[PDB]
Each structure stands twice: as C-alpha cells, then as structure tokens.
Design an enzyme around this catalytic site. Sequence first.
Site, PDB file in Angstrom:
ATOM      1  N   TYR A  53       0.828  -1.223   0.000  1.00 15.23           N
ATOM      2  CA  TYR A  53       0.000   0.000   0.000  1.00 15.23           C
ATOM      3  C   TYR A  53       0.850   1.255   0.000  1.00 15.23           C
ATOM      4  O   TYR A  53       0.388   2.292  -0.430  1.00 15.23           O
ATOM      5  CB  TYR A  53      -0.964   0.104   1.197  1.00 15.23           C
ATOM      6  CG  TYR A  53      -1.869  -1.067   1.435  1.00 15.23           C
ATOM      7  CD1 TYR A  53      -2.217  -1.953   0.410  1.00 15.23           C
ATOM      8  CD2 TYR A  53      -2.418  -1.267   2.697  1.00 15.23           C
ATOM      9  CE1 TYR A  53      -3.069  -3.035   0.660  1.00 15.23           C
ATOM     10  CE2 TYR A  53      -3.259  -2.339   2.954  1.00 15.23           C
ATOM     11  CZ  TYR A  53      -3.570  -3.223   1.942  1.00 15.23           C
ATOM     12  OH  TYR A  53      -4.414  -4.280   2.243  1.00 15.23           O
ATOM     13  N   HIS A 111       0.281 -11.747   1.842  1.00 14.10           N
ATOM     14  CA  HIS A 111      -0.720 -10.919   1.158  1.00 14.10           C
ATOM     15  C   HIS A 111      -1.520 -11.673   0.092  1.00 14.10           C
ATOM     16  O   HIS A 111      -2.733 -11.507  -0.008  1.00 14.10           O
ATOM     17  CB  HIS A 111      -0.052  -9.663   0.563  1.00 14.10           C
ATOM     18  CG  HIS A 111      -0.979  -8.500   0.406  1.00 14.10           C
ATOM     19  ND1 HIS A 111      -0.539  -7.193   0.425  1.00 14.10           N
ATOM     20  CD2 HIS A 111      -2.324  -8.442   0.239  1.00 14.10           C
ATOM     21  CE1 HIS A 111      -1.570  -6.381   0.267  1.00 14.10           C
ATOM     22  NE2 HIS A 111      -2.665  -7.111   0.159  1.00 14.10           N
TER      23      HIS A 111
END
Length: 281
Positions: A53, A111
């Site tokens: 991110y 992830h």
Amino acid sequence: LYFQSMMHAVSSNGANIPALGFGTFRMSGAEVLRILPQALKLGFRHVDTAQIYGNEAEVGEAIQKSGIPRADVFLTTKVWVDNYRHDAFIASVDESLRKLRTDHVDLLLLHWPGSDVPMAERIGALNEVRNAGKVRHIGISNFNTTQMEEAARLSDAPIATNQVEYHPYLDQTKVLQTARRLGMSLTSYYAMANGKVPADPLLTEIGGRHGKTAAQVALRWLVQQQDVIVLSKTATEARLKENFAIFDFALTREEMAAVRELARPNGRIVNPQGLAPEWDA
C-alpha cells in the site's frame, strides 16, 4: 446485555482481533495522516496496512502521535509477494517495523497465495519472525480453502485469520466453513463492494428500518456473522463516525438471510492474475 452493544473482539486462533478495523488499503499517505488520528480518538483500536500500500510510514506516525499506548492498538501488516524468499522476507519485516515505528506488529499476513516461492518457505519465515518477537500472530490473505488447510498444516504456530474480499455480492460459504473448522477467523475487505452497497435498494430498505445507512447494514451483516472481522475505508470524518456506529443495532434473522441472497457469480472485484488462487467454486 451490556456487552452486546459494544464492539467485540473475534477469537482468531488466539489473536483476539477487534471486530472492526481501520483498513488503509486504497488510502493515500496523506489521507491516513489526516483521518487515522481521528479514527483513533473516536475509538478504533485495530489498524490494517500492507507493504504494497505504501502508507506504512504514515500509519506509524499517526499511531505514535495519538497518545494511545502501543499495547492498546492491534496493528496488522502484510508481506508483499516480491519479498517471499526467506532473506527478502526477513529483511522486509524489519523494514516494515522501521516505517511503523514499533518493534512488533500484532499480525503479519502473506498478502497473496500466488508465488513461485514454496508455501513452506513462506510459512517458515512467518514462524521465524513470530518466534523472534517481531510478530505476535501470523495469518494469510486471499487463500482458497485448499491453501488454508495447507497453511494450517505446515505452520507450527496457529494461523489466526484469512483476510479476503467479503461483501453481500460475493459468497464466502466454503471459506467460512473451512475457517471455522481450522479455528481461524475471516477478515473482510471491500465491504462496500466498490460502491454497489450504498446504491442497493434492499440494503437501503433494511437500513431505513433501523435508522441506519445501507453501508452500516452491510458492515453489520459482516460483523454479526460468527468469526468475521471487517475492515472499513473511511476517507472522511463523516463516514468515519457512521462506520463506527454498527454495534448500536442488530439485523433480524430474515434480514440476514435476505442480504445473503445478494451473492452473484460475478461479484468478486479483486482478481489479479498470478497472485490470485483458483478461487473455491
């Protein structure tokens, strides 16, 4: 009862994850620095971020400036797939911790499942950093049921959660059932379904009955399910206060079944080639 009007934590194979979290997915660094301090003041105690991110630094700054003791915040980050080989894995965790301005995270996830790196090597590295005291709890993200079973089997430490896309338009029956058998929770992202939720007539109808928005109805439908945690993206002070006010009310059994009927075979939003698994059918 006194506790049914308060946020619960969700037993997540020993992790005790606050049922509602502040998700920084889709948030810029500047948005995080503005809104996260307010979220923390308002009472959010679960913050979710990821290496990819690019906003871990601002998460770290916001938490530190809040004056909330570290032990009171549940902090999650995620290892990006480029960092999956052992040495890159270990280094990326230390780097995350530098950005987050803390010596440990509460939760570290893989992830995505898609990678050339063997699952046992990634799971091995998760356990290493847990044993080193850098990570309290370990988990996974976007794993299908087959991979959930594999992760639980290969991991010395329990797997706390599988963080997946979950909203009224995407059925997660099989994933939930596997989670519950394995003792892990499900953490939901994209509760609003990229804008579909506030526009939904059924959800606006149910919301009306309770003095709540369609958005709060979708969040409540998640958080009312056993073993489900929800992440919200609140880019403004107004959605912030609204999203937080979901422990005020409850949906009826019939309201729960009706929201469940919204599932569509094409409801999945996030499906990156190579990273995504062969989802359960």
